[PDB]
Structures are given as C-alpha cells and as structure tokens.
Amino acid sequence: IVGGSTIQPERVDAAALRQLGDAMRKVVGSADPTPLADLLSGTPVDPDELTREVGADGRQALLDSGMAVDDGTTFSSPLRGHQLHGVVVLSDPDVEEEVQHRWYVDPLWEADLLIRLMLRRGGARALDMGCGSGVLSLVLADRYESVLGVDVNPRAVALSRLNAALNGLTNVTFREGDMFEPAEGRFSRIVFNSPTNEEGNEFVDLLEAGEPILETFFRNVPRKLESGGIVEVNLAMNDYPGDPFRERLADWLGLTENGLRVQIFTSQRRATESGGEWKRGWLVVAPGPVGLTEVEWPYHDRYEEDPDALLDGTDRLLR
Numbered sequence: 001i002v003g004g005s006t007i008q009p010e011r012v013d014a015a016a017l018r019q020l021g022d023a024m025r026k027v028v029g030s031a032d033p034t035p036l037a038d039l040l041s042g043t044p045v046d047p048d049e050l051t052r053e054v055g056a057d058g059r060q061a062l063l064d065s066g067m068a069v070d071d072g073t074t075f076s077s078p079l080r081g082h083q084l085h086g087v088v089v090l091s092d093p094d095v096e097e098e099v100q101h102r103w104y105v106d107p108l109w110e111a112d113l114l115i116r117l118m119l120r121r122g123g124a125r126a127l128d129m130g131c132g133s134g135v136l137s138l139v140l141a142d143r144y145e146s147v148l149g150v151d152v153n154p155r156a157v158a159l160s161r162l163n164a165a166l167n168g169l170t171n172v173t174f175r176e177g178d179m180f181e182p183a184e185g186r187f188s189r190i191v192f193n194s195p196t197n198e199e200g201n202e203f204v205d206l207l208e209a210g211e212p213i214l215e216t217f218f219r220n221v222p223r224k225l226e227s228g229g230i231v232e233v234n235l236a237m238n239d240y241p242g243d244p245f246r247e248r249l250a251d252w253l254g255l256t257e258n259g260l261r262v263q264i265f266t267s268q269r270r271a272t273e274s275g276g277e278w279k280r281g282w283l284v285v286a287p288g289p290v291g292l293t294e295v296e297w298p299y300h301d302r303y304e305e306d307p308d309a310l311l312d313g314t315d316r317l318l319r
C-alpha cells in the first residue's frame with residue numbers, strides 16, 4: 001500500500017523539474033508549511049493554492065511525474081520532501097513494515113547521519129550501491145567528477161533520477177541492476193547504506209536482504225575499488241560464539257591478499273539468543289596499514305546530542 005506509486009521523471013521536461021526543485025528548496029524543511037511543503041508533508045492541499053506557488057505548468061509537472069495525485073477536490077503526494085546538506089530529496093514516508101510495498105524506498109532513516117559520517121574528501125569517480133532515493137549520490141555529486149547510483153529496485157532508480165533532476169544535477173547517473181552488474185570499471189569512492197538490520201542471514205526484502213548481500217558486496221569490492229580508494233558502509237553485524245563478523249569480513253575482502261585496511265566503528269550493541277552479539281556500525285576501507293581495527297564510537301547517541309560532532313570524526317580516527 002505504501003511504496004508502489006508510479007514515478008516517471010521522464011514524462012516531465014528537465015527545466016520544469018529544476019524549477020520545481022527550486023520551489024522546494026525555498027519551502028521544504030521550513031516550519032509553517034506553504035502548500036507545496038504541506039503536499040510534500042503528506043497533507044492534502046488545495047490545488048489552486050498549490051498553483052499560486054508553482055504555477056499551472058509546475059502543477060502539471062507534479063501530476064505527470066507522479067509527485068502528486070489528483071484526489072478530485074485536493075492534491076496529495078505519495079512522497080515526502082527533505083532538504084539537507086544542500087540537496088532536496090523526495091522519498092517514501094516513514095511507515096510500519098506491515099504496509100510497505102516491495103518497492104518501498106528507504107525514507108531516510110539514517111541518511112543524514114551517514115552523510116555526516118562520510119569522509120569529506122572528493123575525487124574522480126563514485127559508486128553509490130543501493131542508492132534508494134539517490135540521496136547519497138546527490139551529495140557526493142558536489143565533489144566527484146561523476147557518480148553512479150545502482151539499485152535493483154526500479155522504482156528507486158526512477159526516484160533517484162527524479163531527485164537528481166529536481167536539483168539540476170548533471171554529473172549523476174543511475175542504473176537498474178543487481179549489485180555491481182551495471183558498474184563498469186573501478187571507483188575511487190564506494191558508499192553503501194546496506195539493507196541489513198535485524199534479519200541475520202535471512203533474506204526478508206530489499207531493505208533487509210541478509211548478511212549474504214554483504215558477502216557479495218565485500219567479495220567484489222577489491223576488483224571495483226581504485227587503488228587508494230575509499231569504501232564506506234552502514235551495516236548490521238552479527239557476532240556468533242566463536243564466529244565474529246570481523247573474521248568473516250576479512251575473509252570476504254581478502255584483507256592481506258589485497259593489502260586492505262578496514263576500520264569498523266561500532267555504535268549500537270546488543271546481546272542475542274545464541275550468546276552472540278548484534279551490532280550496528282560504520283565500516284571504512286581506506287589506505288593504510290593492512291589489517292582490521294574495531295573501535296566503539298557511539299555516533300547514534302552523539303548524533304542525538306549534537307549532529308556536527310560527527311563531522312570529520314572518521315577522519316580524526318584515521319589520520
């Protein structure tokens with residue numbers, strides 16, 4: 001019921017989308033919403049008041065692209081707008097798992113925090129694996145010559161293309177596919193907000209794909225990573241008795257064989273049935289002494305107190 005709406009930026013002209021985006025930049029994230037911001041808040045709005053704000057052609061672009069639906073009397077949006085780190089981003093609303101369509105897109109549960117964790121350097125070529133709304137791709141576009149976003153969710157690819165268009169971004173490319181299949185060549189930066197959480201080894205859905213999606217990602221990272229390159233990964237990790245996640249990750253990566261350095265920053269931690277541990281952390285591959293290091297960095301708690309404590313934290317902890 002939520003996350004199956006049609007998204008069609010190709011049905012709308014590129015300048016019109018940029019103009020819509022400009023209108024969203026003005027009002028999205030500001031309290032006391034205008035009609036446009038309220039539409040993008042999930043509030044049914046009067047289509048005439050909306051027209052005052054985006055014009056009649058902007059009014060048509062919203063309908064054609066699928067950002068808005070005519071309920072007859074009112075307009076409503078299946079999507080929700082965000083403005084953060086200099087981009088505007090539409091995504092699905094935050095709702096319970098029981099009402100999520102198969103193509104439900106991550107509503108930015110962690111994107112703002114992850115962007116604050118990301119190393120602030122730029123470079124030549126970036127890959128955003130499982131790009132969802134496109135949010136990480138869009139931010140990376142400001143400091144990378146080109147960015148590729150990949151997702152197996154066709155709806156996420158359309159949404160990603162829509163968001164790029166809204167921001168007038170021209171150096172970002174999105175491809176539908178499974179993992180690294182549409183990603184040719186190597187990248188100096190790879191970022192992955194992985195679909196892993198509480199499911200362990202089991203595939204639940206596109207947002208909880210199980211540990212095997214991390215095996216496949218990390219096994220292939222060495223032939224995809226440019227020499228000197230950086231990989232950043234949000235993930236859940238499961239330590240079982242005599243079987244910690246880190247030993248498996250080292251194997252997948254071919255740590256010594258490939259000359260790789262990994263640091264894991266663990267933020268949340270919880271005891272399990274098996275006498276094991278469930279962890280959520282931030283994993284970084286970056287040039288340095290071959291090996292794996294794990295530290296405790298409670299960036300969730302610190303995000304809640306002061307979001308900008310996280311800026312360059314990962315740089316401080318590596319340089």
Ligand SMILES: CN[C@@H]1[C@@H](O)[C@@H](O[C@@H]2[C@@H](O)[C@H](O[C@H]3O[C@H]([C@@H](C)O)[C@@H](O)[C@H](O)[C@H]3N)[C@@H](N)C[C@H]2N)OC[C@]1(C)O
Nearest residue numbers: 094095096097106109110193194195196197207208234
């Ligand atoms: C791409 N990675 C993400 C990953 O960041 C993580 O996000 C969870 C998220 O699902 C949780 O979100 C959960 O809880 C919210 C709400 C009650 O807060 C629900 O509305 C939502 O349906 C539920 N999945 C949230 N509470 C913590 C994040 N770290 O877990 C899910 C994910 C899709 O794998």
Ligand SMILES: Nc1ncnc2c1ncn2[C@@H]1O[C@H](CSCC[C@H](N)C(=O)O)[C@@H](O)[C@H]1O
Nearest residue numbers: 106130131132151152153178179193195206
């Ligand atoms: N085999 C696969 N190949 C590419 N993407 C996949 C995949 N399996 C799951 N995914 C995608 O991984 C994404 C993780 S949700 C993260 C979305 C976005 N990067 C953000 O940070 O908000 C989902 O969009 C899901 O569709």
